[PDB]
């Protein structure tokens, strides 16, 4: 029996909005220590990985593991049905066809109960081990979002290139090209705007801007984004939650 009452009702919506534009059918696996979800997009260059640990819930209960197959388009719709001061609880019995989404006001004057039919979704062959990475950066997610939105107007391809004290973003296209160069810095007054870089090996990788444009939607979940790059594996873009994360693993393009 699954019963999960969210700390903040709006959080789940924020999570789903985080990746509904990458993949539309996902299995959420509920276990005794939280919820995880993984999905690969159709072209198989992008893997989304979600972990919502137990501490994201006001109250959590999963007797036996259950798999909840959801169309994120449908789910998104039901999630609009939620006042910000409302409580959201996920309820499902063992071997369900339905997930119940139960919205409640403190007074209990307005009880909204949605029951969503589950789907049979094939989620097979999901390999996931992160070799050590050549480089790890972190920066504000809005900054990164802006860099990607800007450069994506010039090209379908964004190159990220990392050197001793420099992160360079480069798009080159028909109308011309653009480079954004950023420098790691700390500002001890407002530390949340810092840019930090650990470079073991310098790296130079290109990514499809269409995918980056989806990944940046993770910005609603957290202030910062961690980017892990290696010359021989998929890149990691990570957004942390309190008790979990949203990861996006993206295949670099081939150097033609």
């Amino acid at each position: 029996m699954l019963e999960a009452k969210f700390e903040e009702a709006s959080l789940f919506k924020r999570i789903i909005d985080g990746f509904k534009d990458c993949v539309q059918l996902v299995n959420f696996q509920c276990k005794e220590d939280g919820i995880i979800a993984q999905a690969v997009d159709d072209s198989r260059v992008l893997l989304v990985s979600l972990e919502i640990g137990v501490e994201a819930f006001q109250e959590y209960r999963c007797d036996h593991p259950v798999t909840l197959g959801m169309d994120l388009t449908s789910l998104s719709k039901i999630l609009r049905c939620g006042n910000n001061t409302d409580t959201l609880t996920l309820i499902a019995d063992n071997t369900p066809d339905s997930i119940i989404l139960l919205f409640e006001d403190t007074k209990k004057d307005r009880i909204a109960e949605y029951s969503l039919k589950l789907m049979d979704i094939d989620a097979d062959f999901l390999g996931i081990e992160e070799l050590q990475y050549d480089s790890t950066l972190s920066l504000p997610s809005s900054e990164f979002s802006k860099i990607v939105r800007d450069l994506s107007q010039l090209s379908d391809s964004i190159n990220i290139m990392i050197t001793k004290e420099t992160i360079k973003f480069v798009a080159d296209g028909d109308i011309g090209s653009g480079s954004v160069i950023i420098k790691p810095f700390v500002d001890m007054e407002h530390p949340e705007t810092s840019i930090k870089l650990e470079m073991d090996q310098p790296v130079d990788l290109t990514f499809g801007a269409k995918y980056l444009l989806d990944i940046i939607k993770g910005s609603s979940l957290s202030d910062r984004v961690g980017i892990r790059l290696s010359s021989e594996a998929p890149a990691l873009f990570q957004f942390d939650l309190k008790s979990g994360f949203l990861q996006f693993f993206l295949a670099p393009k081939f150097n033609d």
């Binding site: 950066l137 001793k164 004290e165 700390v186 530390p191 870089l197 650990e198």
Partner: protein, 79 residues
């Protein structure tokens, strides 16, 4: 309210751990590393997470964390 921080200083094939107060300039800590390498402290550029740091500053200036790393590199304005 933790007052001290543990940091590592590395130059590739050799490292030294240090404990210091958050409010103490990195000067002594840099000189110490530079000594055991037998090098001029002006001979060395010191990076923290890609940021170039100067002996005048404290872990809290740079907003450092327990177990953070300072990398020591040779001289260049490049580099």
């Amino acid at each position: 309210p933790e007052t001290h921080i543990n940091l590592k200083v590395s130059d590739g094939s050799s490292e030294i751990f240090f404990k210091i107060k958050k409010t103490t300039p990195l000067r002594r800590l840099m000189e110490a590393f530079a000594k055991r390498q037998g090098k001029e402290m002006d001979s060395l550029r010191f990076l923290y997470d890609g940021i170039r740091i100067q002996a005048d500053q404290t872990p809290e200036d740079l907003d450092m964390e327990d177990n953070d790393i300072i990398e020591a590199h040779r001289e260049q304005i490049g580099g």
